[PDB]
From a paper:
As a proof of concept, we used this platform to identify both known and novel L- and D-amino acid peptide binders to the well-characterized model target, streptavidin. All peptides bind within or near the biotin binding pocket of streptavidin formed by two surface loops [1/2 (amino acids 22–28) and 3/4 (amino acids 42–52)], and by antiparallel β-sheets involved in an extensive polar interaction network, in which residues Ser88 and Thr90 of β-strand 6 play a major role. The surface loops of streptavidin are flexible: upon biotin binding they undergo a conformational change to form a closed conformation, but to accommodate the peptide ligands, loop 3/4 is dislocated by 13–16 Å from the biotin closed form to adopt a well-defined peptide-specific structure. All eight L- and D-peptides discovered in this work bind to the same pocket of streptavidin in distinctive binding modes suggesting (1) the rich malleability of L- and D-peptides and (2) the ability of streptavidin itself to adjust the flexible loop to accommodate multiple peptides with diverse sequences and conformations.
The same stepwise evolution approach was followed to identify hotspot D-amino acid sequences that bind to streptavidin. Two 5-mer hotspots, “wqeea” and “lanvd”, were selected for the extension step with all 160,000 possible combinations of D-amino acid dimers. All D-peptides fold into a left-handed α-helix with one turn for GyGlanvdessG and two turns each for the Gdlwqheatwkkq and GGwhdeatwkpG peptides.
Author numbering:
A (entry chain B), B (entry chain D), D (entry chain C): 15 to 134
C (entry chain A): 14 to 135
Amino acid sequence: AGITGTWYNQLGSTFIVTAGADGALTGTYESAVGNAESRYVLTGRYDSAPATDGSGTALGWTVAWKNNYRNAHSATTWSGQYVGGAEARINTQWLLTSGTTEANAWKSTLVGHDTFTKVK
Amino acid sequence: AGITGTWYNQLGSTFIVTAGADGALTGTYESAVGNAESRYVLTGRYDSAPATDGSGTALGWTVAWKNNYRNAHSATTWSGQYVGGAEARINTQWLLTSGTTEANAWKSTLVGHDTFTKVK
Amino acid sequence: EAGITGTWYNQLGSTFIVTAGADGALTGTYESAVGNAESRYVLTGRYDSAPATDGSGTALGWTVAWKNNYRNAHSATTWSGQYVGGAEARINTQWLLTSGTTEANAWKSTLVGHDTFTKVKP
Amino acid sequence: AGITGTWYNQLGSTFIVTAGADGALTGTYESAVGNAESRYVLTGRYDSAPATDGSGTALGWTVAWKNNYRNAHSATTWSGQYVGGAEARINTQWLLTSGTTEANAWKSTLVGHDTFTKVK
């Protein structure tokens, strides 16, 4: 499957994941600094039987930005695909929703993209 | 938390979820038809200690579209917030990524918005 | 024919007046429900001027940069969607608002949402 | 403004744009992907008086995918910012909506991200 392990995004945020045999993703997400106060639980799912035609392996995961140290009252989901080989990558787009009042709900959600690599 | 229960989106797709003490979301997602072939595992995260200022509760979850009957080689993440009160609602935006070759990756990801309530 | 020219409202009452040109152009203004001049901005976009005849909607999109003579938010929004005809005509959209940021803050430059418009003032 | 010119995205699509003094963007777009041939008209807007604090210049534009050669019954909008630097760049995210039936509207909209430089 090639997904289990440590991954690094374009700015060095660190995605630590186990791809279980049942299609589960479990792990932690943290900043490039690597300090414990920046580390959060993640969970998600992946395609455990992907195509063997050069297509990527679809996956997604969520972090709610609450840990024992802080709480941003927000959650990010990453949706994307793992691409194997000598240029291995996880290519994602993400949605970060903050808890808001209804009056501020129109501006609750940020969107962006993250590309993860196996080396920093 | 108010999140545990059976929810329906605007097209009747059915989200059966449990919100655990630790911030975990677990459950299943299926079509309005309610047939076993359309039912899939989900996992996610939510803010287990939301603000007390009238803001919503941030959350997200993932389904990989593989079960014992079908594999679409794709995964969806929903990112949103739970809004409590008279009529509880979960307002989300979602990203559905299909596994693609690199040449087709431009058309890998659909986006939309789902609103869930506890009534069909 | 196209059904798009005129005034559209979301449920919060933000309002746009648009002309759908025979050339595929969209031109008009976007404003708040209050309708004061400080809230009104130039809108420009494009639509499919020869849509399918199979019951499909009409694809369209437009941009507003949030600068006018009275304010500048240093940002722009694009709405991408489709027009759906009938007595309760609707424009169903999703949108992206990008704010000018430094590179360090670029990860948080872009909001996403959805807007549905109808011809009936709320 | 720095915006006026010929730009290319990461896939080699060609974005030929003029930034008018009135905040207008006009020009043509030639797509390296999809149901597309030759140039398509674009129009959009940009911030003609950007902040002077090091921030980029917000802008957006639309292409409806109809020209004299073909009609994909769809439209893309790009929302982003121009980043003046050593190597000027326009970083965008985009939404491509197809005209669909109501039953297919859930899968009407693709999302992605394009980065443009004046060097191909």
